[PDB]
Amino acid sequence: KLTRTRLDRLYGLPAADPNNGKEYYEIAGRFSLISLVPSNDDYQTPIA
Amino acid sequence: QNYGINLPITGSMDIAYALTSTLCLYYPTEAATEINDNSWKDTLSQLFLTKGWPTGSVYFKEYTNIASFSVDPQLYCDYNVVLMKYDATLQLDMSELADLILNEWLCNPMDITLYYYQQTDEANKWISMGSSCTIKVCPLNTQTLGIGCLTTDATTFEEVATAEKLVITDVVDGVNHKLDVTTATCTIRNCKKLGPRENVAVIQVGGSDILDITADPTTAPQTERMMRINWKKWWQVFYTVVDYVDQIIQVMSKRSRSLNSAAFYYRV
């Protein structure tokens, strides 16, 4: 709700004070990364 | 008397020359479940008494499954007769079990973490026993390097088994082989086939006889100690076994390594 305005019941965070007493919004979780890594093998090496 | 020295034995042909046993049986548990009775052992003991062998000394043991019987068999007895169920999908299990229980194997431990290995005779076979055996092997030429598999890695090996309860393996003579097996559950031993064992005979309770006892594909003979009969009910099988007990005793004999005189010959 914005005081002294023509619209109330606003939705979504304002662009003025998006933090309001917090610096980092810590988010802990598990990530799985199945990627196409560029690497041939333990091959591509002199045999000796 | 003198032991451990092979000496000539004198003989003749004009001199006129021409019990206390201990029987044991191994059978799978499905027979016991099907017979629906538990007092049958007393009947078998009485029938053995009728033929002539004393009671009290006869022991019976059961195994949950042919795989359960496969891992570390125990054979301390005088006349071993084992009933092995036949199948059309598990030929190698029966073959390896009969081969292991039919011939004596002088074995040594194998450490595949600090050594290499090679064969030097036609009786050199590798026996793996455990709960989860997966033998992974990469051949090495005379220059000690991998062919078709890199020695540095181990996943690229050419496997010969996968979670097998027991697996007998043979390798090409004259070359080294680097091995990597999960030793935390399964053991690999280097055994040499010294000679035949008559103390154990196997009766294939089933159909098409498929047993081979020789590692070379050239010869696959049918030994006399390998018996085979048809079956629908286990009581018929037991009746046939007890009726022909004399033939089974005649074809078999006392173990050729515990005669109380063959000492210092790898037994007693």
TrEMBL record, chain A:
<protein>
    <recommendedName>
        <fullName>Outer capsid protein VP5*</fullName>
    </recommendedName>
</protein>
<feature type="short sequence motif" description="YGL motif; interaction with ITGA4">
    <location>
        <begin position="11"/>
        <end position="13"/>
    </location>
</feature>
From TrEMBL, chain B:
<feature type="binding site">
    <location>
        <position position="164"/>
    </location>
    <ligand>
        <name>Ca(2+) 2</name>
    </ligand>
</feature>
<keyword id="KW-0812">Transmembrane</keyword>
<feature type="binding site">
    <location>
        <position position="171"/>
    </location>
    <ligand>
        <name>Ca(2+) 2</name>
    </ligand>
</feature>
<dbReference type="GO" id="GO:0046872">
    <property type="term" value="F:metal ion binding"/>
</dbReference>
<protein>
    <recommendedName>
        <fullName>Outer capsid glycoprotein VP7</fullName>
    </recommendedName>
</protein>
<feature type="binding site">
    <location>
        <position position="243"/>
    </location>
    <ligand>
        <name>Ca(2+) 2</name>
    </ligand>
</feature>
<keyword id="KW-0472">Membrane</keyword>
<feature type="binding site">
    <location>
        <position position="93"/>
    </location>
    <ligand>
        <name>Ca(2+) 2</name>
    </ligand>
</feature>
<feature type="binding site">
    <location>
        <position position="173"/>
    </location>
    <ligand>
        <name>Ca(2+) 2</name>
    </ligand>
</feature>
<keyword id="KW-1015">Disulfide bond</keyword>
<feature type="disulfide bond">
    <location>
        <begin position="107"/>
        <end position="191"/>
    </location>
</feature>
<keyword id="KW-0946">Virion</keyword>
<comment type="function">
    <text>Rotavirus attachment and entry into the host cell probably involves multiple sequential contacts between the outer capsid proteins VP4 and VP7, and the cell receptors.</text>
</comment>
<comment type="subunit">
    <text>Homotrimer; disulfide-linked. 2 Ca(2+) ions bound at each subunit interface in the trimer hold the trimer together. Interacts with the intermediate capsid protein VP6. Interacts with the outer capsid protein VP5*.</text>
</comment>
<feature type="binding site">
    <location>
        <position position="243"/>
    </location>
    <ligand>
        <name>Ca(2+) 3</name>
    </ligand>
</feature>
<comment type="subunit">
    <text>Homotrimer. 2 Ca(2+) ions bound at each subunit interface in the trimer hold the trimer together.</text>
</comment>
<feature type="binding site">
    <location>
        <position position="166"/>
    </location>
    <ligand>
        <name>Ca(2+) 2</name>
    </ligand>
</feature>
<feature type="binding site">
    <location>
        <position position="171"/>
    </location>
    <ligand>
        <name>Ca(2+) 3</name>
    </ligand>
</feature>
<keyword id="KW-0945">Host-virus interaction</keyword>
<keyword id="KW-1152">Outer capsid protein</keyword>
<keyword id="KW-1038">Host endoplasmic reticulum</keyword>
<feature type="binding site">
    <location>
        <position position="37"/>
    </location>
    <ligand>
        <name>Ca(2+) 1</name>
    </ligand>
</feature>
